[PDB]
Design goal:
The structure is cut from a larger assembly and holds chains A and B.
Chain A lengths: L1 H12 L1
Chain B lengths: L1 H13 L4 H37 L7 H32 L1
The chains are: A mainly alpha, B mainly alpha.
PDB class: structural protein
Keywords: nuclear pore complex, Nup205, Nup93, Nup188, Nup155, NDC1, Aladin, structural protein
Entry title: Cryo-EM structure of the IR subunit from X. laevis NPC
């Protein structure tokens, strides 16, 4: 879920 | 799971020797309602990770500081919740 968590956060970023 | 269904079905045969089915079909649709959403979220997440992989080369070494301060914030909040819950457990222990 840390790949998906970085996904949620960076998707919020990019 | 299969063995349990099998024991149940053997019992159903024993007693045998349409409301439930439509109920099962309704629940079947229900479960996958959320699973299509999980697919949507995974897909948005994967496209985003690919977006990141595009920047992945050498990029900016500042997002590291950004996420690390985020780590300080998230660990602080988690320790808040942890101490809170543990103090509630000590409260129940006293009571």
């Amino acid at each position: 879920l840390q790949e998906i968590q970085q996904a949620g956060e960076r998707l919020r970023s990019k | 799971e299969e063995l349990k269904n099998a024991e149940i079905a053997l019992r159903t045969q024993k007693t045998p020797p349409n409301t439930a089915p439509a109920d099962y079909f309704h629940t079947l649709v229900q479960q996958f309602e959320v699973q299509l959403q999980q697919y949507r979220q995974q897909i948005e997440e994967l496209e985003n990770h690919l977006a990141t992989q595009s920047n992945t080369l050498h990029l900016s070494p500042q997002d590291l500081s950004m996420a690390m301060q985020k780590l300080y914030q998230t660990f602080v909040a988690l320790a808040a919740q942890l101490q809170a819950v543990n103090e509630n457990f000590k409260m129940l222990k006293e009571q």
